[PDB]
Amino acid sequence: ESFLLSKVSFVIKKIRLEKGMTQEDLAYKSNLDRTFISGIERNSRNLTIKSLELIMKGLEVSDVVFFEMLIKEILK
Amino acid sequence: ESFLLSKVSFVIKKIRLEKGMTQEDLAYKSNLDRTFISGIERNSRNLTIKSLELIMKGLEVSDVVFFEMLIKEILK
DNA sequence: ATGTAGACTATAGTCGACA
DNA sequence: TTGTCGACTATAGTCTACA
C-alpha cells in the first residue's frame, strides 16, 4: 500500500510512546475507538484528516512538530 | 470545521493554480473524481491520506515540499 | 497493553447531467 | 471551468468480545 500512510503511522507510534501513553488512552483523548488506532499503528489503515486532527490533539502535539518529524522521517 | 482541513485544501488549490492545472487536469493525474477535488477545495470535505498522497502525485509535488508549504500556511 | 475478527454504521469517493 | 445535486460503491471508524 501507501508509502506515506505507513510513515505517518510510524510517526504516530513514536510520539505516542515518547509521551508514554497506552492505545486506549489516546483513543479516549482522540475520541476515536481504540481498535481503529491499533489498525493504524500496526497495519497502516487509511485515516482521514479529521481523524489525524484528533490524534494530533490526542498526543497534545503541534500540527507542526508532527509534520516536521514526518519530514525527517520521509527523508528515508 | 477542521482547521487542519481548510489549511490542507488551500495548499492544494495554491499548488494547482501555480502549476496552472485545471481541476479536471488534477482529477486525471490523481486518478480521482472532479466533483471530489471540487468538494475538498471548495467546501472542506474530508479526504484521507491515500487521497492526499495521490494528490501530491497529481500535483507532481514531493511530499516533503507539500508539508513544508503546508506548515508555513498554518503559521499565518 | 495489544491484535484481530466480524457485524455494523457513517461518510469517503464514483459517476453522469446541467447551471 | 468549475460547483452542485442525486444516486450510486467503497471503505473508514465503531463496537463486542477473547486470546
Author numbering:
A (entry chain A), B (entry chain B): 2 to 77
What does the paper say about this structure?
The most widespread of these mechanisms employs a “controller” (C) protein encoded by a gene downstream of its own promoter, and usually co-transcribed with the endonuclease (R) gene as a single transcriptional unit. The C-protein binds at various sites within the C/R promoter to regulate transcription of its own gene and the associated endonuclease gene. Unusually, in the RM system Esp1396I, the C-protein also represses the MTase (M) gene by binding to the promoter at the transcriptional start site, denoted OM where the C/R genes and the M gene are transcribed convergently from different promoters. Flexibility in this loop is very important for DNA sequence recognition, as it has been observed in the nucleoprotein structures to adopt different conformations depending on which operator site the protein is bound to.
We also crystallized one of the mutant proteins bound to DNA and have determined the structure of this DNA-protein complex, to compare the conformation of the DNA in the native and mutant complexes. The overall Y37F-19OM structure was essentially identical to the native complex, with an RMSD of 0.5 Å for the main chain protein atoms. The three major DNA base-binding residues R35, T36 and R46 were in essentially the same positions as those observed in the WT-19OM co-crystal structure, making the same interactions. The structure of the DNA duplex in the Y37F-19OM co-crystal structure also closely resembles that in the native complex, with an overall RMSD of 0.6 Å. The tyrosine residue Y37 in C.Esp1396I is implicated in DNA bending due to its interaction with the phosphate group at the highly compressed minor groove in all the known C-protein-DNA structures. However, we find that the overall bend angles of the DNA in the Y37F-19OM and WT-19OM complexes are effectively identical at 54.7° and 56.0°, respectively. This would suggest that the missing hydroxyl from the tyrosine, and concomitant loss of a key hydrogen bond interaction, does not affect the DNA distortion induced by C.Esp1396I. From the Y37F-19OM co-crystal structure, it is clear that the only major alteration to the binding interface is the loss of the hydroxyl - phosphate hydrogen bonds, of which there is one per protein subunit.
